[PDB]
């Protein structure tokens, strides 16, 4: 298996771990803050997914410092993981185009 495909699969597994850990740590950080809505794990996981994908509907958002720091990690992990997937697709296309050119 080539590196870029192994790295993509590794990034996908790492992203799932960030989503699960991010959902657990957000609830742990948001409870205790009056008005916080990111205080139950099922919707916290939904919030983490729409954060890593950078969709950000606005139905859920962190208000505490550590809840927002968790959000930052989720954002970077999601942007990086999907970016590595795009990078792997580019390598696949470039490698196929080299063979298409004989070189």
């Amino acid at each position, epitope marked *: 298996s080539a590196l870029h495909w192994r790295a993509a699969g590794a990034a996908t597994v790492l992203l799932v771990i960030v989503l699960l850990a991010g959902s*657990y740590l957000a609830v*742990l950080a948001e409870r205790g803050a*009056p008005g916080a809505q990111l*205080i*139950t*794990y099922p919707r916290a996981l939904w919030w983490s997914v729409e954060t890593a994908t950078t969709v950000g509907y606005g139905d859920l958002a962190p208000v505490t410092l550590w809840g927002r720091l968790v959000a930052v990690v989720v954002m970077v992990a999601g942007i990086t993981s999907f970016g590595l997937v795009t990078a792997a697709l580019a390598t696949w296309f470039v490698g196929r185009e080299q063979e298409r050119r004989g070189h």
Partner: antibody
Amino acid sequence: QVQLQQPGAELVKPGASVKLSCKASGYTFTSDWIHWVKQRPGHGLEWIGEIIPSYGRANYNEKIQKKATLTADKSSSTAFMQLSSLTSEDSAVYYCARERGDGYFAVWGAGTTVTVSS
Amino acid sequence: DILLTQSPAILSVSPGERVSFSCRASQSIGTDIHWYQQRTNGSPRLLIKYASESISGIPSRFSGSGSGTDFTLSINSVESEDIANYYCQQSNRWPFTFGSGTKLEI
């Protein structure tokens, strides 16, 4: 089997302190929160605080006077609420409840009738 | 914090008649309301979770409705075992808050 086990009663002198217990059994997950609810005779339910035993962080109701300290012991699966400087206004029934991190209190304890008297 | 008003405090119903309990929230909480039953000298018992979801072991006559700020706990054909206090509790915003409670008498 009963999931949350609390003592029957505790007699506390005015100003003295007491520590209540709540032995947990059944399924226990890392997403468990133990809550404490206060109910005076002739009153509704009053949320006191919460604690996650898999991490040890405790939150408290900021509307009321803070007279509690929530601890947890994972080796014996027992949460503790330490009440300090008790007056007659603190005499109530104190329940413990287990929340699976999804909002509601699925199971309650029998409650410990705390009577502050001389 | 979120305020949960239950009015009226006492509901008088003849046997075998439907009875509805009211729980109004100071602000919208979607469907994050939960109902409990407490008989005399008893511990609270979960009846309905998330406004309208059933609980295993709870009789079929118990149901719930509503979303937003107004929530209803309905008991089809009230019986003597249903004589207790009924509380609502919200889980949308921290901290969790309870309602004042509504007593059912027959």
